[PDB]
Amino acid sequence: GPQPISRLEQCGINANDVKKLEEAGFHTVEAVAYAPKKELINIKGISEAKADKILAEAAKLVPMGFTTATEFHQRRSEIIQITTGSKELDKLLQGGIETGSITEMFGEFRTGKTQICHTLAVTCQLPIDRGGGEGKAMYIDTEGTFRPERLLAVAERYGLSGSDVLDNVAYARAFNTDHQTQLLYQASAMMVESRYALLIVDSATALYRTDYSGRGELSARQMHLARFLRMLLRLADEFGVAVVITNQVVPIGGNIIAHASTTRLYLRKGRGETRICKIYDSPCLPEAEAMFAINADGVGDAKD
Amino acid sequence: GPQPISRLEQCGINANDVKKLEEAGFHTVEAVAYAPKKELINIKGISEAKADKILAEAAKLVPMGFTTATEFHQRRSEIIQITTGSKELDKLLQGGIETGSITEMFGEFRTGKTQICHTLAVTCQLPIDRGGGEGKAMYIDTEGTFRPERLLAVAERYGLSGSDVLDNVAYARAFNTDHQTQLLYQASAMMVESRYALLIVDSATALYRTDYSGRGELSARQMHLARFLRMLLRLADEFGVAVVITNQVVPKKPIGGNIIAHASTTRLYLRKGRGETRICKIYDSPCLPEAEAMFAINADGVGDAKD
Amino acid sequence: GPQPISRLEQCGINANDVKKLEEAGFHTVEAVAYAPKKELINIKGISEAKADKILAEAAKLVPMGFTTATEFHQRRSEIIQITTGSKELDKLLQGGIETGSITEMFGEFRTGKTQICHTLAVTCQLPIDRGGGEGKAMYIDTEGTFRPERLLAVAERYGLSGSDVLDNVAYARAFNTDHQTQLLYQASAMMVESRYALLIVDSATALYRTDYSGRGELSARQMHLARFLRMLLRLADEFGVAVVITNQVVAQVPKKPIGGNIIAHASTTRLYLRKGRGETRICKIYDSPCLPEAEAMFAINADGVGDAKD
Ligand SMILES: Nc1ncnc2c1ncn2[C@@H]1O[C@H](COP(=O)(O)OP(=O)(O)OP(=O)(O)O)[C@@H](O)[C@H]1O
Ligand SMILES: Nc1ncnc2c1ncn2[C@@H]1O[C@H](COP(=O)(O)OP(=O)(O)OP(=O)(O)O)[C@@H](O)[C@H]1O
Ligand SMILES: [Ca+2]
Ligand SMILES: [Ca+2]
Ligand SMILES: [Ca+2]
Ligand SMILES: [Mg+2]
Ligand SMILES: [Mg+2]
């Protein structure tokens, strides 16, 4: 995976600058390789020449040039996709949910988004041959809906160790936008020493609906949301995790969330426990419909 | 094709000066001729008289004077237009997408901005008889939404070889604005060895939205964007390629301000129609009337809306 | 028209001095007469005595004294104005574009400055009876947006031959500010053989935005722009042509033209363009020494700028 920031100390950078970068937020070399010189200058104890040297050393360690499309195709042919537990959804998504890209699921009030998030969180720890990724899951709730009993019930279906499953899912809650942003830095610091395969942010843009109800305060809300999405994309690129976010339709979030998201899914109520999932936006998937139901076990095919 | 910069060696310029110019970023005689004196002076190993001699020698090889409109008309009546794969869009554009100028597309999400670029990256390799440009393609990515499977599908539709079209596409990923600008210098470096016909930037204004935050950073943001667009224009002029860029839409207005509106030559406004059909409208053009067209995104790329 | 500089040889000036003047940039007696002594001294082969002798001889051939206002009124009553192709714009401008001065059009994108430039380039070749300048046109382009097909369409509208219209237009492309300034010397050199009636620069400020980037280069930018505008004024005074330039807008932190006070003070007439409905546009008088502040409406059709239909 990513190379730890300790490599720069060996490369020639003194330990004090490495500590300054670590306390700044950069942890895995590629974090400072992807950052502009302005961000490095913003650090209180780094000069322009020091920033230039650090950027050159970081660029010397990672490839940041041109390459053919054959190499990219070969690299992408081994991208890990995480299953959802439903055969129809797996067929619709052509394998499952891809890593390294942001996926957004949105719908009406209580249309089954949190159940999908729980199923993804429990299934991301499965072995690859069974459709998992062998990685710890991080769950960032902001509405207070995390129910561990659902995790126990769904893990009973696959027969995994419930205590081990609950030990492999980090949990956090945010009360305002600033804490939500700082949780991203905490996750970036935490992901260095452990293997994470799936990061979940629950229904987002909800705090921006209420905390930013003013008329002239809209621009700050939009800018903060854009920065949050950019940080999410940076994390997904850096650690190769499948960021799954959630949204709710009443619009105040705007087109920023739609542009930033790579794959979007639309969920609507059906008949009984059956619900409809429709691909809303994707660069490589056609529009289609799928039937899925949420039973007591979790998320699965609509059995009739 | 452009003349390599080595032609200045036998005109009276020693090798080390040519090496300094090549390290600066110039790789053709046209690039040296078009550059102002200030750019040449700023090089550490170049003096006043040296710059004057270099400029005179470069101007001796490149025509930079007056002509008539008949000669320009004759020259322009043979430029290459790359078809978009849709007959209606080709009729709307009166031939296809024009080389040597900048074309900008903007609109909502799922409007087909990336699908058009994916189709063009394959169509630019067709023979001129079939409507291609007979050259390679270059792709610069910002959101990381490059999918070679679309290229394979389009190549299969047009009866080409998938491996051949894959080997003819150069791909790069930009993580910030500075890398985005450095990739242009690298592209200028690598555009002399082979022949390229199309250059794609997608997106062009995505990173500027979040890289510059404070209200005191607006001027620097706009100046950086202007420099980027000027570099794109320089590449298009000196290599005769077709530059296509993509914009976001924030009854709708694209982002970027007046700089990108003035710099762009042709602007296409894309909005979703019904089903898989989309509507393209000409938003700005020096020679094209304001009209509309219908097209669809099928399983093999952008094509006519079949019903 | 102007008198060629070879006339000075009969007054007691050696041929080599005239050749030095010609290679310096002067091609008419008027250009030498208007020039200050510093410019003549700057030439390598000219001394102070030679400079003052040349200045006296040149001033002997042109009038540079006082006169009454009746004579100026009578002379100005015979000035030439070029129609814009739209009756509303001609009524607003009281005849059309005026020769001998600098006219500037500015506005955001899509407003139609380039269309007006193309229409004027075609129109300035009409006879004075029909509202033309009866001369050639010169087009200087800095953005690569020159389209001869628009010229052919506009010429077909007026029942002219397309081949002659295309033959009577000179086109140049500028790649930087230094080249943009250098093209004016060649323009002055080639304006003596034939008769020109219109000079178009489009646009005059596009390259200055990127050639000088930082705040430390603002003063040099403005001085270069001022020198370019002074050269344009000298050309307009020397050859009696109509100079039309275009400009871009910036957002006030609601749109104002770029260029600062130099281009605001230099320009004589300023036109403000903005979009109306459909293909129709609105033109407003921004600054003029003799025209009231008013508005007019025109449209961009398939055959160039014209009056809005219905
Ligand atoms: N194989 C396919 N068959 C049919 N339609 C497809 C296929 N692949 C993608 N699409 C269509 O592509 C559309 C998305 O278009 P595209 O990826 O070009 O968006 P975009 O304009 O780049 O959006 P954004 O603003 O998010 O970048 C989807 O609505 C989907 O219907
Ligand atoms: N043949 C035509 N018929 C109708 N409209 C046309 C035709 N050719 C061009 N147009 C219109 O001309 C407009 C473009 O304006 P143009 O580029 O000439 O001026 P501008 O806005 O001053 O330019 P710039 O983008 O360089 O600042 C578009 O709205 C387009 O619809
Ligand atoms: Ca999207
Ligand atoms: Ca434009
Ligand atoms: Ca004035
Ligand atoms: Mg896209
Ligand atoms: Mg224009």
Domains in chain C: ranges and CATH: 1-73 (1.10.150.20), 74-310 (3.40.50.300)
What is d(CA A204, CA A209) in angstroms, rounded to the nearest whole number?
10
* Experimental method, per PDB record: cryo-EM
**SS3 call for A262:** coil
Tokens (6 digits) for A226: 């854009």
What is d(CA C169, CA C151) in angstroms, rounded to the nearest whole number?
10
What is d(CA B207, CA A227) in angstroms, rounded to the nearest whole number?
11
What is d(CA B245, CA B201) in angstroms, rounded to the nearest whole number?
5
What is d(CA A45, CA C243) in angstroms, rounded to the nearest whole number?
56
Residue C96 contacts by C-beta under 8 Å, 6 or more apart in sequence?
Answer: C81, C82, C83, C84, C89, C90, C131
Neighbour tally for B131: CB within 10 Å = 18
B109 is in an annotated binding site: yes
Please say whether the beta carbons of C61 and C29 come within 8 A: yes
What is d(CA C36, CA C34) in angstroms, rounded to the nearest whole number?
7
- For an interface test with B, the pick among C115, C147, C207 (most B C-beta atoms closer than 10 Å) comes out as C147
Which of B169, B176, B209 comes nearest A36 by C-beta?
B176
Sheet of B169-173: strand order equals A67-68, B169-173, B136-141, B196-202, B242-248, B102-107, B266-272, B277-284, B292-298, B301-303
What is d(CA C199, CA C180) in angstroms, rounded to the nearest whole number?
13
Helices B69-76 and C148-157 meet at what angle, rounded to 10? 120
What is d(CA A209, CA A213) in angstroms, rounded to the nearest whole number?
6
Calculate the alpha carbon distances from A289 to A206, B58, B79, C61 in Å.
Answer: 27, 62, 45, 89
Amino acid code (one letter) for C284: K
Please say whether the beta carbons of B84 and B120 come within 8 A: yes
What is d(CA B178, CA B186) in angstroms, rounded to the nearest whole number?
13
Residues in chain A after which the backbone breaks (C–N beyond 2.5 Å)? 250
B111 is in an annotated binding site: yes
Which of B36, B72, B226 comes nearest C209 by C-beta?
B226
What is d(CA C92, CA C114) in angstroms, rounded to the nearest whole number?
20
How many residues belong to chain B? 307
User: Which residue of chain A has the CA closest to B210?
Assistant: A227
Tell me which residue has tokens 């080595």: B6
Calculate the alpha carbon distances from A58 to A13, A40, B113, B281 in Å.
Answer: 11, 12, 33, 45
Neighbour tally for A99: CB within 10 Å = 21
Tell me which residue has tokens 């005191």: B216
Q: How close is the nearest chain C Cα to the Cα of B160, in Å?
A: 35
Comparing CA positions, the residue from B243, B303, B241, B246 lying closest to residue B269 is B246
Q: Which long-range contacts (CB under 8 A, 24 or more apart) does C75-83 make?
A: C80/C128, C80/C133, C80/C197, C81/C131, C82/C120, C82/C123, C82/C124, C82/C131, C82/C132, C82/C133, C82/C197, C82/C198, C82/C242, C83/C123, C83/C126, C83/C130, C83/C131, C83/C132
Phi and psi at A92, nearest 5°, equal -65, -45
Phi and psi at C308, nearest 5°, equal -65, 135
Tell me which residue has tokens 């814009």: C84
Query: Strand locations in A213-273, DSSP E?
Result: 242-248, 263-269
Neighbour tally for C71: CB within 10 Å = 9
Amino acid code (one letter) for C188: S
Q: Where are the alpha helices (DSSP H) in B133-217?
A: 148-158, 162-167, 177-190, 206-211
Comparing CA positions, the residue from C281, C205, C200 lying closest to residue C248 is C205
Residues of B in contact with C210 (CB under 8 A): 226-227, 230
**SS3 call for C27:** coil
C139 forms bridges with which residues in the sheet?
Answer: C171, C200
**SS3 call for C157:** helix
DSSP state of B199: E
What is d(CA A84, CA A116) in angstroms, rounded to the nearest whole number?
8
Numbered residues of chain B with Cβ closer than 8 Å to any chain C Cβ: 33-38, 64-70, 72-73, 76, 100-101, 218, 223, 226-227, 230, 237, 257-258, 261-262, 264-265, 283-284, 286-287, 289-290
Please say whether the beta carbons of A207 and A176 come within 8 A: yes
Strands A169-173 and A289-294, by their bridges, are: unpaired
Tokens (6 digits) for A269: 């109520």
Please say whether the beta carbons of C208 and C221 come within 8 A: yes
Count the helices and strands in chain A (H runs, E runs): 14, 12
Q: Is the CB of C115 under 6 A from ligand 2?
A: yes
Tokens (6 digits) for A209: 């609906």
What is d(CA B110, CA B296) in angstroms, rounded to the nearest whole number?
12
What is d(CA B174, CA A92) in angstroms, rounded to the nearest whole number?
31
Q: How close is the nearest chain C Cα to the Cα of B275, in Å?
A: 28
C269 forms bridges with which residues in the sheet?
Answer: C103
Neighbour tally for C302: CB within 10 Å = 11
d(CA C111, ligand 7 centre) in Å? 9
Contact C167 B70 (CB under 8 A): yes
Amino acid code (one letter) for C263: I
What is d(CA B105, CA B246) in angstroms, rounded to the nearest whole number?
5
